[PDB]
Design a protein around this ligand. Structure first.
Ligand code: ADP
Ligand code: ADP
Lengths: 53, 371, 371
């Protein structure tokens, strides 16, 4: 007859229960701006190279 | 002042000052929220719940699990958890100590960058570090070389460490941890067909994983005993309600580690992965690792793993050379313990991140500066 | 009658008669088998699958890879592959032609002996030969002297050839080929942390290696551009499913060839190996090789390699003397093409093995008789 607390809480719950949306939103969006450095791990690489040849 | 370490190795979460023998207390990193209209008006509505508080409250709460596969799923939830842990257990303010962070190795930068960003900004904290599990595992186990297996709540590891150095190429990293195994358990359990699926219902299994599991010595022979005997079968109660009694379904579970068919993947298993990763690494070192073989945490708790592991290595090793493994009592705590040691040495004063850098350069700092 | 050549240079496998411009068709040498209970009873169960048939069928199949490091792993599997190739593509019977075999140089006798043994016995074939890659590479490239670099699917090569002769001491042979690089790629890729490990998942990378790679002109300067720009970054789909978009992770990959730290080894790299191997070889010839410098196949496909190579040689050479390199379009086919030329000349009629010898003496015949 209505739109109610009962239904709104249903929607709320389902929202809370839906893992796919929130996890995808955080992980996939945050996955893209991942990386910028002249790695010191690569500093190791360079140093080794210096020692290499 | 004094120095404080968070363990965020998944499962219950471990936090404690440098030099205490064991963390003050420990929390699952469950997060959970209401499921039903709140109908006691007298009740205060809190919309999110965590920790043993939730562990009590569970039934109308429903769980979210903020770390998949060792990757932490939803940051603000973490922030809730983290804040709670400081204030409620620790009675601690972010300024109070350097803080040390505990990381799955070889996993996406994002966890580094946001973790540091949040904790320097949202918390404001003198010094920060993030450290790879195996290092702690060695320090606690106190053998400068080694290889570690620790399959926690989360993603499951092989790292050889030689004394004083990393072999990051050597390393193997696997999503096989006990949680997913447990969820396979239900697909077992419906054979006896007492059957329930939800998150809390899934955690109920964890107790059984404590109590009822033990490692198969030999699979065929065990099946033969399974045909012979019921001593293999033990009787256990619901946490409340029924008595339940369980057959081979107990021992069959760990074999997944040796055979991840049962939830089906190919990586040829813990042991074959290990020997593979060895045969990657170079020739001379190997004997030491044959000597020094080290295991820890969630799965390892099971009685007997080390034995069949040794059986496996005796299969794969040239028998000629010595083999042994270490199985310390305290493995599940091991990491945070090692972290305490890690905290102790003054060299991190040379080594910590400071707020100043975070001012002068971004999260990018970490990935050079830390491993 | 007519004469037929198999290429077993690894990667897709190439076969064709003398005098055709290009082999009739080409196959990966994947081998794969079922992973799951066969549950359509209507289905015919075939237990092993190969070639583009498998490449379609892959998902429930799982792969075996019958050549490691240019060394062919499991003979009977090869025999399956080989039989299939003849009958299904070639519609050919072993009697029909002499057949020519294509070999990594400087590698264990066993491949010679069993290969010949099988193919004379299991197949029965008028004439047999096994030939070293570089010879073909020269013939196709048509400069009687030279040095060749060809880093295929399999083990990666330096041979100087002078006109009409071998310098087997001169030669360098390396397991650095693109496959292992690709498997390193994943240990890169988890930084962005879209992450999957299995064989088919690994081959999916091959497409990206086609599409997305290009050679670093300068590493430092590239990092500076990496800080500046996103044009370095390109957007690419899953073969089906998502769009994926990739940064420096593309260009960083080939540098491994120049720096095999990233999966860590010492051999000072392609170029330094080359100049080393030169400085082994004698003094006067060198100018010719400075002129005549030749590259082919799997890695070389990348745009730009020749340029930075030349940059490297200009580093290491005394600048005073001319330098250039050859980068033909067709390099990946080059070997089989050269093989066709090799097949053409009547002198192999003097040179082939015949069944008679195999009757009268063993596999031992080869190692005298062939290079
Ligand atoms: N008594 C027990 N017996 C066996 N396994 C247990 C027991 N208690 C906890 N575990 C398992 O050990 C793990 C605890 O998390 P942990 O090992 O700390 O993971 P992480 O390595 O991510 O820190 C979980 O997989 C949990 O189910
Ligand atoms: N389009 C492409 N771009 C770059 N590399 C490729 C491409 N197609 C195939 N490759 C690589 O080239 C090699 C093909 O095998 P091949 O070069 O014939 O090896 P071999 O020298 O052992 O015969 C493999 O390493 C494959 O991944």
């Amino acid at each position: 007859x209505x739109x109610x607390x009962x239904x709104x809480x249903x929607x709320x719950x389902x929202x809370x229960x839906x893992x796919x949306x929130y996890x995808x939103x955080x992980x996939x969006x945050x996955x893209x701006x991942x990386x910028x450095x002249x790695x010191x791990x690569x500093x190791x690489x360079x140093x080794x190279x210096x020692x290499x040849x | 002042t004094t120095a404080l370490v968070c363990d965020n190795g998944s499962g219950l979460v471990k936090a404690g000052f440098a030099g205490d023998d064991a963390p003050r207390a420990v929390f699952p990193s469950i997060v959970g929220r209401p499921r039903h209209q709140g109908v006691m008006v007298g009740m205060g509505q809190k919309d999110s719940y965590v920790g043993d508080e939730a562990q009590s409250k569970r039934g109308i709460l429903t769980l979210k699990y903020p770390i998949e596969h060792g990757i932490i799923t939803n940051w603000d939830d973490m922030e809730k958890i983290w804040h709670h842990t400081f204030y409620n257990e620790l009675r601690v303010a972010p300024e109070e100590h350097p803080t040390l962070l505990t990381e799955a190795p070889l996993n996406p930068k994002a966890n580094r960058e946001k973790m540091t960003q949040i904790m320097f900004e949202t918390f404001n904290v003198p010094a920060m570090y993030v450290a790879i599990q195996a290092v702690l595992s060695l320090y606690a186990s106190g053998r400068t070389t080694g290889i570690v297996l620790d399959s926690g709540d989360g993603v499951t590891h092989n790292v050889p460490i030689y004394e004083g150095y990393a072999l990051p190429h050597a390393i193997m990293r696997l999503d096989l941890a006990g949680r997913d195994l447990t969820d396979y358990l239900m697909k077992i359990l419906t054979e006896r067909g007492y059957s329930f699926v939800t998150t809390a219902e899934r955690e109920i299994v964890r107790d059984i994983k404590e109590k009822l599991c033990y490692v198969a010595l030999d699979f065929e022979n065990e099946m033969a005993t399974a045909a012979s005997s019921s001593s293999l079968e033990k009787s256990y109660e619901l946490p409340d309600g029924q008595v339940i009694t369980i057959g081979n379904e107990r021992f069959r579970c760990p074999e997944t580690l040796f055979q991840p068919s049962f939830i089906g993947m190919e990586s040829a298993g813990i042991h074959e992965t290990t020997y593979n990763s060895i045969m990657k690494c170079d020739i001379d070192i190997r004997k030491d690792l044959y000597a020094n073989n080290v295991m820890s945490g969630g799965t390892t708790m099971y009685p007997g793993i080390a034995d069949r592991m040794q059986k496996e290595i005796t299969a794969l090793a040239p028998s000629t050379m010595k083999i042994k493994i270490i199985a310390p009592p305290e493995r599940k705590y091991s990491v945070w313990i090692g972290g305490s040691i890690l905290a102790s040495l003054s060299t991190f004063q040379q080594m910590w991140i400071t707020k100043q850098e975070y001012d002068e350069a971004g999260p990018s700092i970490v990935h050079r500066k830390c491993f």
